[PDB]
Amino acid sequence: WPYFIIDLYHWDKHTQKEKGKIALQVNQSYGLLRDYFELAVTWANEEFREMFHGPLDRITTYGGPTSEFLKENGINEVVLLDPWAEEVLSEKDFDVKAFIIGGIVDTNKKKTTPKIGEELESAGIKVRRRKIVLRGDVVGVPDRINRILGIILKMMVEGKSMDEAVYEMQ
Ligand SMILES: Nc1ncnc2c1ncn2[C@@H]1O[C@H](CSCC[C@H](N)C(=O)O)[C@@H](O)[C@H]1O
């Protein structure tokens, strides 16, 4: 029912190995969403589709900006899964029409995803920066795209709590 968007921002700024890991995690994110309830990939260029070893027919890919995709569907506010926020994702945010997970990997961590929110705000989009915590700290929370998507799904679909959802995906 809602939109799980993967923001392929910073795509051409990653190495070939890192590009493959992003395409792998998006593939695993689809198969995970396949066993639940819808997966969107913005900034989805030709190279991503070339590296995506899954069915392009089964997901929604848009080569343009994420903000354009949100406007083209009437969505004015989203939830940005961001480990750098100070407010934690709660059931009060399960009413938004789209959840955004930035297609980002690491090699040591940097502070990248809040720039996606700054870009969405500059395009006139209400953004709810929400962090996923385990016992108050983000340490121990798996930060892979497919793991983050699974944590949210166990909370929305299966009604688990955040601590239970994080540990089961951990
Ligand atoms: N603790 C957390 N809470 C919410 N989202 C998280 C998260 N950990 C990882 N993610 C999601 O997983 C994606 C890639 S992990 C992000 C890598 C980098 N260290 C950074 O934070 O910028 C991000 O887009 C983010 O939305």
E strands, the chain, in order: 3-7, 39-42, 60-62, 77-81, 98-102, 126-130
What's this structure's resolution in Å?
Answer: 2.9
Distance (Å) from CA 83 to ligand 1 centroid: 5
Counting from 1 in the atom list of ligand 1, the atom nearest the Cα of 113 is 22
Q: Residues with Cβ within 6 A of ligand 1? A: 81-83, 101-102, 104, 106, 109-113, 131-132, 138, 141, 143, 145, 148
Counting from 1 in the atom list of ligand 1, the atom nearest the Cα of 111 is 22
Q: Could you give the C-alpha distances from 129 to 20, 57, 94, 137, in angstroms and in order?
A: 27, 31, 13, 16
How many Cβ atoms are within 10 Å of 71's Cβ, its own excluded? 14
Task: Report the residue among 84, 104, 152 best suited for mutation to probe ligand 1: largest number of ligand atoms under 8 A from its CB.
Answer: 104
Contact 160, 116 (CB under 8 A): no
Method by which the model was determined: X-ray
Distance (Å) from CA 88 to ligand 1 centroid: 13
The residue type of 139 is V
Distance (Å) from CA 53 to ligand 1 centroid: 23
Q: Of 52, 55, 37, 48, give the one whose Cα is nearest residue 12.
A: 48
